Amino acid sequence: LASLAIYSFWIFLAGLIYYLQTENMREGYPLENEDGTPAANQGPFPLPKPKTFILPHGRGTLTVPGPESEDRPIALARTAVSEGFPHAPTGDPMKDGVGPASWVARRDLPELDGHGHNKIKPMKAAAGFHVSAGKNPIGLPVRGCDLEIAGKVVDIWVDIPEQMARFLEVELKDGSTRLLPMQMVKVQSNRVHVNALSSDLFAGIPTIKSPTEVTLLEEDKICGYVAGGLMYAAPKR
Amino acid sequence: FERKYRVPGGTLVGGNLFDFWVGPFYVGFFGVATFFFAALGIILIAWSAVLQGTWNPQLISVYPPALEYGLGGAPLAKGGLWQIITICATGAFVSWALREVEICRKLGIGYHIPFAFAFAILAYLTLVLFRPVMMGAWGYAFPYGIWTHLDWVSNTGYTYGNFHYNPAHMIAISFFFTNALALALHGALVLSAANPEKGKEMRTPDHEDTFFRDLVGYSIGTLGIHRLGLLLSLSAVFFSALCMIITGTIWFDQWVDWWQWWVKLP
Amino acid sequence: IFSQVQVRGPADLGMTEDVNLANRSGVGPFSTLLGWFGNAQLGPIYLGSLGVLSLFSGLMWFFTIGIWFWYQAGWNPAVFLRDLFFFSLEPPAPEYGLSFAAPLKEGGLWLIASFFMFVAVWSWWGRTYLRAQALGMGKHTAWAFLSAIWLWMVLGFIRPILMGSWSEAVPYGIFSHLDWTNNFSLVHGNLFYNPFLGLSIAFLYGSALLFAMHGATILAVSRFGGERELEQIADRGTAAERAALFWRWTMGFNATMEGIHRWAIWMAVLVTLTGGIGILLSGTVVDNWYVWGQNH
Ligand code: BCL
Ligand SMILES: CC[C@H]1c2cc3[nH]c4c(c3C)C(=O)[C@H](C(=O)OC)c4c3nc(cc4[nH]c(cc(n2)[C@@H]1C)c(C(C)=O)c4C)[C@@H](C)[C@@H]3CCC(=O)OC/C=C(\C)CCC[C@@H](C)CCC[C@@H](C)CCCC(C)C
Ligand SMILES: CC[C@H]1c2cc3[nH]c4c(c3C)C(=O)[C@H](C(=O)OC)c4c3nc(cc4[nH]c(cc(n2)[C@@H]1C)c(C(C)=O)c4C)[C@@H](C)[C@@H]3CCC(=O)OC/C=C(\C)CCC[C@H](C)CCC[C@H](C)CCCC(C)C
Ligand SMILES: CC[C@H]1c2cc3[nH]c4c(c3C)C(=O)[C@H](C(=O)OC)c4c3nc(cc4[nH]c(cc(n2)[C@@H]1C)c(C(C)=O)c4C)[C@@H](C)[C@@H]3CCC(=O)OC/C=C(\C)CCC[C@H](C)CCC[C@H](C)CCCC(C)C
Ligand SMILES: [Fe+3]
């Protein structure tokens, strides 16, 4: 056998690789890529089959491959002529949420843990939840990349299941509160430094509808706005 | 999706100049540098195939300048072409890393992938730049050949007896083995969840975390296991690069004899 | 990276299912150590019968090997701690057959200890099926663990019986197994020309390529909640979206937050799958791989 077995194994691999693996990646990524001819750059094969996900506690059925387009508008005028170029933004990309600022319209509902309840809600609303090591961010000045303070930390919003600080609630100087991703700030002892953003603005962060819960839609809008600041804020590089 | 992301920007070196996409592939300054370098090393290998009379990949090989040349130069055919191809390999690897750095900026994403890739580069440069320079002769390095580098592997392994006994190597292996287990387990965990027992509703991280506590009695975070992947693999190749940088430079002996340090006093 | 602030609240239990045996310990949180990297909560564990069966036979195996090691050092501190690595529990080696049961120091020792290691591991398989069933998860973890069990089974049970002798099995000793692995190369005509070992190394390297890559992309897509893999699979947004656009713009193709885990299970299980296949042949069919190569 042996030479039979190694030949057979290389057959198997050819099976495995495209007709499970890359087929199952075609299921969303980027879903019969069209801005012109939908497959074309190289011979694929094919677009996988529908698979439906019944979504947990509540309602849902996701059938992928997704027949979907975001119309919800990409404010991007194309630099054209040699057709494969950068699409420029028509106005301020940051507010328009495009490029490194891009949000995705996910669901405008909060993600509810294993037993239908908000995954992230603020520490005010968490039963005996409090900071067990490291600087306590609450009450620190919040300073942006241009070294100017744009508020103060008021609360930590925590993921309960996998117990973790996910957001900081920052009260801007005028009682407006902004939510800010923990993965974007540097909690020191004398200030909390947000490098991605300018102080004088910060204000532009998408606002929450309830003050005690954030939706998937909103999370993406906040995080996207923040990250885009890294490119789009000339006071830093 | 894609389209809203294709905005003009990022780019370390190369200004506006190179900011375009050849289809899926972003180009950029380090994109053309990767191309330029891969073309040069391919030409020089094609050239060493011709100079030995084979175009077959089981047989095409490029070996280093033999021990007497030191860290000097060699004739292309008596060593020099491995040397030039190394420069194109290091150049083409470092461009690719800095190619990733530029796509990162444009995607407003984190630097972690180039940082991880730099470790594979470090391992490579151990064998090819650092351990030879340390040992005085480029010839200690490995030949660029599908079979002939395993020939080099077995000879250097066996020049020290059973090279399992090299301590930093033992633990490098220990991470390689743990990281594979960690991958099988992690992938299998998410697919335990996203694809539940037939007509069930999708599971939760809460289910994931609970499964691993029932088996083991702990569950690192979801964030935590991706912190774990990155570290097990970069330790496996760190300790691997150490293992192959002490041997030859400070341990010049049959590795079995290390352990006798422990074996005597009582 | 590392946590900056640790946040705690009470303990958790997201249904540890049938007969609620799964509460041994309830808690024991580690902050300063486990919580700066991962989660802090230690426990609760399940332990139900098979879990006791594995730990009983696992410990038993481990202890058996220990009484023979002490016999090798007689009884001693000093000497025992000195030669821990160098002790061994070689098979009936004394290579005279499968021959059902050899004398205690000649084969007994090993067959007895192997019995407990056989039971310990198989019951733990059983466990991984059950613990999954109960949370309505589905077999994946006990899909993967079978290729591990495959390489284990070919190196100790199935190849020694395919060779008609228990002597072809691996010893229970630290240094012994490092040597057995070397000699198996030597007496099989330089195992590098074994086509399967070449694929196994390609996949073992491939796994440290892929978890390094995966790990690094989620940690780079951390700030858009990318670690919430299971959610992004149910309703995709930015972090999933531009995590994959990184690889499409670098190497030319990409993955779905689900599907990269479909790549990764396989990219790891193929290490002991192919490898196991490779050892099953090395002795049993191909006497010498150098020759095998040449003769085509
Ligand atoms: C055979 C003789 C000896 C022995 C001799 C040696 C020797 C000699 C060496 C090792 C090394 C290693 N050995 Mg050993 N080893 C033995 C037995 C074993 C056993 C075993 C089961 O017994 C195991 C598990 C190992 C394990 C290991 C690894 C820990 C280590 C490999 C490091 C690494 O992955 O490098 C990291 C990987 C790289 C360097 C790859 C870098 C890739 C670069 C960046 C990019 C390439 C780009 C590509 C060309 C682009 C193509 C683009 C196309 C589009 C595709 N050895 C026996 C006893 N071992 C090596 C080591 O320590 O590592 C330095 C080493 O030199
Ligand atoms: C491609 C296959 C890869 C793989 C996969 C894999 N392993 C797996 C699984 C999978 C998918 C499991 O689900 C199962 C698991 O439960 O994981 C946590 C497991 C597992 N893989 C393990 C080990 C392991 N896997 C290995 C390799 C691999 N596993 C491959 C890389 C290796 C090697 C040889 O490097 C090892 C050592 C086990 C930890 C675990 C379960 C095996 C089992 O059944 O264990 C039962 C054992 C006992 C009851 C006896 C325990 C006795 C010891 C506690 C004695 C003392 C040890 C000592 C070092 C001190 C104590 C240490 C600490 C506890 C303080
Ligand atoms: C923690 C380190 C681990 C790691 C990580 C890693 N590898 C990475 C990354 C990361 C994080 C990438 O981002 C990058 C990637 O884009 O992946 C698709 C990559 C990558 N790792 C690769 C391979 C690779 N990594 C390896 C190992 C590892 N990579 C470690 C396990 C190995 C081996 C053998 O273990 C290999 C073969 C590539 C698939 C990919 C991209 C590397 C790259 O630079 O691509 C550019 C391509 C060219 C410039 C064409 C090459 C032209 C040269 C002139 C040829 C030179 C010849 C060479 C010197 C010798 C060939 C001889 C051998 C056959 C003996
Ligand atoms: C000098 C010896 C030569 C050699 C030999 C060799 N390699 C081998 C073998 C041998 C004899 C194998 O059997 C194994 C293989 O499968 O062969 C294809 C392997 C192998 N050599 C490998 C790599 C390798 N070999 C190399 C070289 C060589 N290998 C040398 C030429 C190299 C080099 C030089 O680059 C590499 C990278 C791997 C690909 C493969 C081993 C695959 C692997 O990672 O799997 C380990 C997993 C197991 C052994 C399964 C165990 C699962 C059980 C369920 C665990 C039970 C646990 C227990 C109860 C205790 C639990 C403790 C805990 C609770 C703490
Ligand atoms: Fe993951």
Domain ranges across chain B = 1-159, 160-259
CA-based nearest residue to C247, from A234, B84, A29: A29
Is B226 marked as binding a ligand?
A: yes
C205 and C151 assigned to the same domain: yes
B149 annotated to bind ligand: yes
The answer to whether the Cβ–Cβ distance between A1 and C10 falls below 8 Å is no
Strand, helix or coil for residue B30: helix
Tell me which of C89, C110, C138 is where a domain ends.
C138
CATH class of B1-159: mainly alpha
d(CA A98, CA A117): 32
Dihedral, A9, A11, A13, A19 alpha carbons, nearest 10:
-150
Chain C residue numbers touching A30 (CB-CB < 8 A): 248, 254
> Is C188's Cβ below 8 Å from some Cβ in B?
no
What is the DSSP pairing of strand A164-171 with strand A120-122? unpaired
Looking up residue C170, the CATH number of its domain turns out to be: 1.20.85.10
Q: Give the tokens for residue C233.
A: 């699979």
- Nearest protein Cα to ligand 2, atom 51: C58
Q: Of C91, C109, C138, at which residue does a domain stop? A: C138
Distance of alpha carbon A25 from alpha carbon C253, whole angstroms: 9
C128 with C245, same domain: the answer is no
| Nearest CB neighbour to B20, from listed A84, A89, A102 | A84
* Buried-state track B2-39, b at ≥16 Cβ within 10 A, e below 16: bebbbbbbbbeebeeebbbbeebbbbbbbbebbeebbe
Q: Are residues C192 and C246 in the same domain?
A: yes
The answer to whether the beta carbons of residues A161 and B209 sit under 8 Å apart is yes
Q: Which residue is listed with tokens 């008596």?
A: B78
Contact C10 A224 (CB under 8 A): no
The closest alpha carbon to C211, from B41, B178, B129, belongs to B178
Q: Scanning every residue of chain A, which has its alpha carbon at the shortest distance from the alpha carbon of B209?
A: A162
- Do C159 and C34 belong to one domain? no
Q: Considering CB atoms only, which of B113, B202, B264 is closest to C217?
A: B113
Choose among C71, C77, C85: nearest CA to B266.
Answer: C77
Kindly state whether residues C84 and C143 are assigned to the same domain. no
Which atom of ligand 4 lies at the shortest distance from residue B162's CA?
Answer: 1
Min Cα separation C278/chain A (Å): 9
Query: Cβ separation of C243 and B104 shorter than 8 Å?
Result: no
- The answer on C272 and C144 residing in a single domain is yes
- Whether A110 has its CB under 8 Å from any CB of chain B: the answer is no
- Domains of chain A and CATH, by start: 1-105 (4.10.540.10), 106-237 (3.90.50.10)
Interface size, chain A vs chain C, as Cβ–Cβ contacts under 8 Å: 161
Topology of the domain comprising B160-259: Photosynthetic Reaction Center, subunit M; domain 1 (1.20.85)
The verdict on C109 and C151 lying in the same domain is no
Number of domain units in chain C: 2
**For residues C164 and C97, is the Cβ–Cβ distance under 8 A?**
yes
Resolved by: X-ray
Range of the domain at C286: 139-296
DSSP codes of every residue in B61-122: -B----GGGTTS---GGGTHHHHHHHHHHHHHHHHHHHHHHHHHHHHT--THHHHHHHHHHH
- Judge if C7 and C129 occupy the same domain: yes
For residue C92, the distance in angstroms to the closest alpha carbon of chain B comes to 24
For a mutational test of ligand 3's pocket, the pick from C209, C213, C214, i.e. the residue with the most ligand atoms closer than 8 A to its C-beta, is C209
Round to whole Å and give the CA distance between C296 and C31: 60
The CA R_g of chain B, rounded to the nearest whole Å, is 24
Give yes or no for A91 touching B (CB within 8 A).
no
**Looking at the structure, do residues C110 and C195 belong to the same domain, yes or no?**
no
Q: Which helix (H) or strand (E) holds A87?
A: strand A87-89
C112 plus C186 within the same structural domain:
no
Q: Do B7 and A84 touch (CB under 8 A)?
A: no
Resolution in A: 3.0
Encode C202-243 in three state secondary structure: HHHHHHHHHHHHHHHHHHHCHHHCCCCHHHHHHCCCHHHHHH
